[PDB]
């Protein structure tokens with residue numbers, strides 16, 4: 001009964017240090033491991049679970065009763081449960097386990113012919129078994145361990161199909177999670193990213209790879225503090241401190257299909273405004289309008305693109321929301337109007353917590369919040385008071401419809417004073433400088449629960465508000481992990497109402513489904529080579545979770561950057577879907593114009609290339625928004641049948657076609673990256689115009705094409721270089737240079753056409769006005785497909801409207817042209833001019849065409 005293979009031992013003492021006698025008293029096996037680790041106290045196969053009874057078939061699927069006869073060692077076991085199994089789509093299986101006698105907290109969320117899955121049940125002990133129909137692989141099997149279902153402790157386990165599992169944000173981790181007895185804690189926490197810690201967000205979703213390259217996904221729709229325990233059998237245990245078991249299985253079979261299927265439940269990513277894809281520049285310490293204006297002037301003088309100027313807390317009156325000081329920021333409204341007049345946008349920090357200490361009637365956000373009962377309340381029904389920047393603060397309850405109306409009003413009123421273009425919502429874990437409240441917290445089972453997950457500080461109260469505090473929908477205990485998400489929803493709505501165009505919200509704290517409303521930055525990362533490297537898996541992870549608008553603070557936030565690190569970080573950071581350089585108060589400056597000439601040239605090239613690629617990056621955001629695609633994606637999402645890609649997370653793709661192989665270490669002049677099977681063209685063979693000086697071309701010419709069998713390749717990568725390769729068979733739209741997207745969007749466009757050996761390629765362009773609401777619903781867009789075939793390039797017009805009708809195509813660069821053409825035609829007429837490079841196999845064609853009018857370019 002205790003002959004259980006070590007890797008297959010499930011912990012019978014997750015709650016406390018236990019003795020052999022206590023362990024055997026629990027009906028468990030005590031066997032010390034021979035050297036988190038393998039549990040010494042573990043469940044025999046006979047450990048009491050639930051029994052399945054009265055399984056019944058409905059049109060949607062199945063229902064049953066689950067009955068526990070022997071209590072567990074947790075208090076308040078729920079001895080009778082109800083199982084509901086819903087066969088919702090061919091790709092999506094959904095089951096819930098609930099208390100049929102009591103409504104329990106549930107997360108608020110908007111809802112051959114055969115399924116890809118089959119489902120069976122173990123009677124005793126109870127388990128759900130989910131097979132992939134096509135190959136019979138066991139994907140879920142909850143029979144592997146007992147079901148625990150107590151008022152403050154839920155535990156459901158499964159086997160995993162492989163050692164390869166990704167998800168369960170937010171943590172500083174490789175993209176593929178360690179199955180070596182790893183405890184992953186979901187409890188939104190203000191902490192500078194560091195290993196083994198619960199960070200700002202919580203996404204209870206994993207994607208598991210299967211031998212051969214198929215995959216499935218599992219979503220536990222549960223917002224309670226939880227541990228997820230991975231063990232090397234391999235197996236996973238969900239351990240939640242409340243709510244219900246609400247489980248979605250997504251059958252793929254392709255990893256990209258698993259992500260789309262998950263986003264069909266939690267929501268497709270929001271479409272950002274085009275300007276949001278430009279460069280953002282921020283620091284803590286731009287302490288006046290004069291200093292802030294000098295930033296834009298200094299960027300412009302040195303020919304650095306900048307779409308969005310930001311401020312941190314500097315702008316506020318005594319660090320209070322919806323104010324600006326009348327010292328350094330007396331002319332704040334004029335500064336923001338000037339930014340707009342120059343074709344730029346403006347962003348500023350907003351905190352959730354509202355100053356509670358000002359004289360009555362002197363501070364409308366607090367006074368009006370009090371009147372309308374918007375704040376989280378304590379035992380006596382008064383506002384819970386904590387401490388953040390302004391001092392004493394109350395915490396808005398963004399589950400209260402009246403708080404949403406109050407937040408809408410405060411945002412609209414402040415926008416009437418200063419016409420900001422979006423919101424940077426920080427400290428929304430929610431972060432508290434003191435423990436719980438100024439008044440501490442009561443002694444109850446929510447503050448002191450029977451199972452405390454592995455949170456930093458060992459309490460749910462650490463760096464946040466009391467767990468037993470009251471919100472409109474439930475206690476903070478149940479809603480904590482949604483705080484940031486609820487603020488992002490409230491802010492998205494506020495900005496729509498205030499501005500009448502697409503909102504731009506960047507949030508610290510997140511939950512599953514955040515991407516439907518907002519983007520994310522990875523928080524208080526150190527200016528270190530280790531954090532540069534760590535940013536790549538974290539940006540990829542957020543893309544798998546449907547938050548494609550993600551990035552890290554370019555050059556890093558905490559401490560002092562070096563010039564070399566800032567060059568490398570700007571190079572990689574130009575491929576973050578959200579690109580902002582942000583910097584801490586006491587740090588040395590790290591704006592692009594603050595470095596040496598050679599470092600400026602490299603940074604200017606990185607920003608020039610990003611601006612040139614914005615039509616393509618915007619098109620990838622359209623695919624995310626309409627089809628649940630990723631924008632930045634790991635190689636294994638694009639080439640899952642190549643197992644060599646599974647552990648790659650220091651390279652990234654943009655969409656299907658652009659492979660970015662950054663240098664992530666000091667003193668390197670080369671980089672080794674994985675190239676999937678195919679031809680990869682060096683993007684340096686595509687001509688790009690810059691407004692300012694770029695690095696001199698390299699001393700030694702580089703290989704124009706990598707012809708890979710699926711292999712590791714060492715690339716030259718001097719300080720002034722980042723490796724970017726374009727996949728053969730793809731066409732990329734580009735647009736001419738500008739210091740803003742207002743300027744760049746007016747420029748003529750270009751195509752980069754990467755031919756297969758067989759002379760084929762395909763690409764697309766999505767174009768709209770860059771900021772209106774309801775574009776897709778109203779049809780206010782242009783959509784064009786580009787096709788290369790048999791020495792011809794054509795466009796196919798999917799939709800052409802006024803937005804996109806004027807788009808000028810002036811250059812076509814064709815890669816992989818084996819022989820000098822004798823003639824190049826545009827619509828049957830010899831072109832004005834073309835160049836062919838025999839060394840690089842590049843055909844560069846000058847044309848005068850319209851994206852929105854059928855053309856035919858040919859060569860022979």
Ligand SMILES: *[C@@H]1O[C@H](CO)[C@@H](O[C@@H]2O[C@H](CO)[C@@H](O[C@@H]3O[C@H](CO)[C@@H](O)[C@H](O)[C@@H]3O)[C@H](O)[C@H]2NC(C)=O)[C@H](O)[C@H]1NC(C)=O
Pocket residue numbers: 378379380381382383384385439440441
């Ligand atoms: C629920 O939250 C309210 C705040 O909204 C808490 O009110 C606070 O109650 C404490 C006493 O328990 C007050 O401290 C007292 O301050 C006065 C003078 O300011 C001093 O003379 C007393 O010796 C004492 O320190 C505190 O002022 C008050 N805070 C505010 C903003 O009024 C209440 O305690 C909370 N209830 C629970 C059970 O946590």
Ligand SMILES: *[C@@H]1O[C@H](CO[C@@H]2O[C@@H](C)[C@@H](O)[C@@H](O)[C@@H]2O)[C@@H](O[C@@H]2O[C@H](CO)[C@@H](O)[C@H](O)[C@H]2NC(C)=O)[C@H](O)[C@H]1NC(C)=O
Pocket residue numbers: 053054065067
């Ligand atoms: C499993 O179900 C049986 C039978 O339940 C009946 O049929 C169902 C479809 C539904 O219509 C129920 O309302 C019916 O009662 C349960 O056994 C019955 O228990 C009831 C009440 O305790 C008793 O009056 C009946 O005589 C029992 N019927 C039989 C045929 O034994 C049983 O309790 C269910 N098991 C669990 C664990 O809930």
Ligand SMILES: *[C@@H]1O[C@H](CO[C@@H]2O[C@@H](C)[C@@H](O)[C@@H](O)[C@@H]2O)[C@@H](O[C@@H]2O[C@H](CO)[C@@H](O)[C@H](O)[C@H]2NC(C)=O)[C@H](O)[C@H]1NC(C)=O
Pocket residue numbers: 559560586587588
């Ligand atoms: C980040 O750097 C600052 C500033 O460093 C100083 O100024 C630079 C131009 C450079 O020449 C450095 O070598 C200088 O030391 C550090 O703040 C300084 O810290 C020292 C020692 O604690 C203190 O005596 C100085 O007065 C500080 N100078 C200023 C202008 O604030 C800071 O410690 C560095 N941060 C980290 C994390 O190492």
Ligand SMILES: *[C@@H]1O[C@H](CO)[C@@H](O[C@@H]2O[C@H](CO)[C@@H](O)[C@H](O)[C@H]2NC(C)=O)[C@H](O)[C@H]1NC(C)=O
Pocket residue numbers: 045124125129138141142143144
């Ligand atoms: C699901 O997991 C359960 C438990 O690990 C598996 O059932 C065990 O299988 C072994 C080996 O065949 C038996 O000797 C044990 O008696 C089984 N235990 C129980 C509780 O039944 C089961 O095989 C797995 N299901 C699938 C399809 O893999």
Ligand SMILES: *[C@@H]1O[C@H](CO)[C@@H](O[C@@H]2O[C@H](CO)[C@@H](O)[C@H](O)[C@H]2NC(C)=O)[C@H](O)[C@H]1NC(C)=O
Pocket residue numbers: 291292294295298591
């Ligand atoms: C913008 O650039 C100007 C000019 O380089 C900076 O002003 C100089 O700052 C140095 C300190 O490093 C002073 O000693 C000089 O007096 C300034 N020179 C001039 C010509 O004014 C300025 O600090 C930059 N501002 C920002 C916000 O980056």
Ligand SMILES: OCC[C@]1(CO)NC[C@H](O)[C@@H](O)[C@@H]1O
Pocket residue numbers: 284312313349426427508523524557582583584
């Ligand atoms: O806490 C000090 C830093 C700061 C101040 O607003 N808050 C936390 C954010 O993560 C930072 O980006 C931000 O600069």
Ligand SMILES: [Cl-]
Pocket residue numbers: 018019020021
């Ligand atoms: Cl002992």
Ligand SMILES: [Cl-]
Pocket residue numbers: 413
């Ligand atoms: Cl007013």
Ligand SMILES: [Cl-]
Pocket residue numbers: 104105473474475478
């Ligand atoms: Cl509740």
Ligand SMILES: [Cl-]
Pocket residue numbers: 644
């Ligand atoms: Cl390999």
Ligand SMILES: [Cl-]
Pocket residue numbers: 826831846847848849
């Ligand atoms: Cl032409």
